[PDB]
Symmetry: C3
Subunit: 299 residues, 3 copies
């Protein structure tokens, strides 16, 4: 039975592909890199999808248990999210298939959150100790992804609806998360999910940049400032994060890193803090590269 | 002694009147509908005002008790709020009386919040269990209403001050509310007040649209996205909300619904997501219609 | 051994100097006032710096203890903050020295927050009772100050990064703070730090106005509305704040007051709510004047 969190791997790859895609006109070779990443991401995605279908068929009670858990349910959101990203990738070759995947991912994530998260407002199941970074996945990241993907297909206003849902849900959840981390923190086996704390700002700004045609304005800059603050915090925290050793869970970081890379390209195109953008692009690529090496070593 | 929450009924009606008012030039008959609602709202308001004056005279200790409660005090805010809305209505016939009611409502709500809510920051009276949706009424809804009403009279910058107070107070309160609902939720007899959770975004966007002359921009769209997210959540939660049976408390929903309707008209005028706007207008009207039928049945 | 909080005194003075500086072209004499304040602030700053160096040399374990405390550490942030403000002042005479102080303050505050605040996310040291207004100093005020100071030197985009970090950190911290004040509040000896609750909006809008060349737009007005709401709340709370008597801790208020004054000038220049701006300027000056009188009386 495939661990649901493993969908984090094509996610990272997929998102990195998109970042590279935006560098084509400045640097033709980028296209190749993008294509390669795209294909690899897509491949893994297919595989995992198949594996997950098998899970649904044989290990269904496992799926049901992770679904009902007020903590683990969030990772199921990785499935429509990656679906959408693969859509994005496939758009460069076949827009129709892409659109199909994007609508499936969007409807899927909306249905999922509606059911499960509202259910959380019923009370008594979610605990203070359930306040985990993974909660950003159904609540926030899925909506940003829908916003960017819909923008890709030319549904910009719709995109703005999903973007708004994402951004405000982000601002509404993060306060209690950070208070919780200050007071009880996390057990070590959860510590890698701290990586997800890096994602919101960057994913936010990426989605934002996708909807407003890459215009780097005041909001984008603001979002970047908070993003880099969170990056410095997590960098200083990293030895503590990996106190009990390196693991595959570190793939959490990938989503934020990839988004950082993506947003970096827009900042570069608009000639805004180009040195910072180059540093961000390179740093995120190196880090995800190390994740890939680590992962191959384990395999 | 009149239950203070009953002011929720003219509130709903009043707000719906305003929504219909904005459809006059597109659909002359709307004016009639608006007028009718206006008058009815105004009528009930007068009645309730009179009843409340009587309360002040004879059941004063009851008023004092609801005032001192860290939970029930919030409903008193319904009185200046509805005052203002009646002002809005009456503006179509007599701007001077309207202005009088609007300033009375504005000063009243500001005084009320200053005294009572700051007092809450003194500590020791408010409890974790006091974290109720009703708190949005003095903290958030009253300021949005002041903003829109002041905008009506041409005091736009002042309007922006109240709008800002409302929006930021909203974002500052909602995180702890939603964490609380996730963990302990609410006893059934409070569950109808979940309806108030629908209001902020829509009331926000309505106020915003009133101050910026109905221009549908990026902020308005964002606000709508979060509004509809909350709507879907509450729709899925509705059987749970009315688990112990239908009641008059369901009038909570009305404020959000009416605002949804109101904002829908601006979206329709600006040709933004017109299908969505029509659906929102119709849905909110049908729902408030059902509230009215239910209410007459009880009477 | 100098109490670290004493850096609040030149801070206030420094910030007030800057406010007066902006009134020169409208009122030549303002320049003199500004200059005087500047010099005085600078003088005290030097003194305190020297004293603090001595602290580092002889009472180091005291410094270490305040550093490790999840409550008292925040006041150390007053040192880079005031450093920057003195930079601002000195800019009118010598831009190079100013730039040196500004970069020292900026790097210092960033390093400080990175280390200490991230460390807080490690868990187990910070308690619910550690949720104090003073936390705004490293998390929020330092970044706003960096943003405005950097804007002064012409690094506007960089300024936007720090501004964004500040604003979003503000919105992310305040919800749990205000819930905490509602439930357990503060012991009397901490109550003066309630003054810091006045600062964020005003400091925010000041920084914002510095980066966007004094243009009073919708964001600025919004920020002001919330600022004045918090002012009214604190005014009503003031007798409770000083229940156990007047003290030097009241210098907390100064930062907010000075910023109010500063932002007032921009509002005055842009002809936006000029009556309100005059009232704000005068009120803040009178209040800080009273702080100065009180302080001299104690000396
Ligand atoms: C942003 C991308 C998120 C990275 C996903 C990797 C999360 C690995 O982490 C683990 O995942 C498991 C799910 O399979 C969970 O059951 C565990 O609770 C979690 O710790
Ligand atoms: C989480 C809170 C984020 C605040 C978003 C701030 C948006 C800033 O808004 C800015 O206003 C300017 C007016 O001078 C315009 O010129 C810019 O285009 C606009 O983006
Ligand atoms: C947005 C409009 C709010 C709807 C008001 C209906 C609230 C009904 O609800 C009840 O109201 C009573 C006040 O009379 C309170 O004492 C009760 O606590 C509350 O449950
Ligand atoms: C709660 C946080 C809400 C964030 C509000 C986002 C405001 C978006 O700001 C937008 O900036 C654009 C610049 O491209 C302008 O063109 C738009 O007019 C402006 O509204
Ligand atoms: C915005 C400016 C902040 C005002 C600083 C005055 C704070 C006085 O207050 C005291 O300061 C001491 C630090 O010396 C702390 O140890 C105490 O906890 C605190 O109460
Ligand atoms: C904390 C959340 C703050 C929300 C910031 C709202 C920014 C409002 O954004 C405004 O959009 C307008 C479009 O009509 C533009 O004309 C204004 O310049 C822009 O500032």
């Amino acid at each position: 039975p495939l661990p649901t969190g493993y969908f984090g791997i094509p996610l990272g790859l997929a998102a990195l592909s998109l970042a590279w895609f935006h560098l084509e006109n400045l640097f033709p070779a980028a296209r190749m890199v993008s294509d390669v990443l795209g294909i690899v991401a897509s491949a893994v995605w297919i595989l995992f999808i198949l594996m997950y279908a098998y899970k649904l068929r044989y290990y269904f009670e496992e799926v049901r248990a992770e679904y009902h858990s007020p903590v683990r349910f969030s990772f199921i959101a990785l499935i429509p999210i990656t679906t959408m990203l693969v859509g994005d990738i496939l758009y460069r070759w076949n827009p129709l298939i892409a659109e199909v995947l994007i609508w499936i991912g969007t409807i899927g994530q909306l249905l999922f959150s509606t059911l499960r998260v509202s259910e959380l407002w019923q009370g008594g199941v979610f605990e203070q100790k359930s306040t985990h970074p993974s909660f950003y996945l159904p609540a926030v990241a899925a909506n940003f992804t829908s916003a960017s993907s819909l923008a890709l297909l030319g549904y910009h206003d719709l995109g703005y609806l999903f973007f708004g849902a994402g951004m405000i849900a982000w601002i509404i959840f993060e306060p209690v998360l950070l208070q919780h981390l200050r007071i009880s923190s996390l057990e070590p086996q959860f510590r890698a999910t701290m990586g997800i704390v890096l994602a919101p700002a960057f994913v936010c700004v990426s989605a934002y940049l996708s909807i407003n045609h890459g215009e780097v304005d005041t909001l984008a800059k603001i979002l970047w400032g908070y993003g880099f603050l969170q990056l410095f915090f997590l960098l200083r925290l990293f030895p503590w994060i990996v106190e009990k050793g390196l693991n595959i869970g570190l793939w959490a970081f990938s989503f934020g890193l990839a988004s950082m890379a993506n947003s970096a390209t827009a900042f570069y195109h608009g000639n805004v803090l180009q040195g910072v953008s180059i540093f961000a692009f390179v740093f995120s690529n190196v880090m995800i590269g190390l994740l890939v090496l680590m992962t191959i070593y384990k395999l």
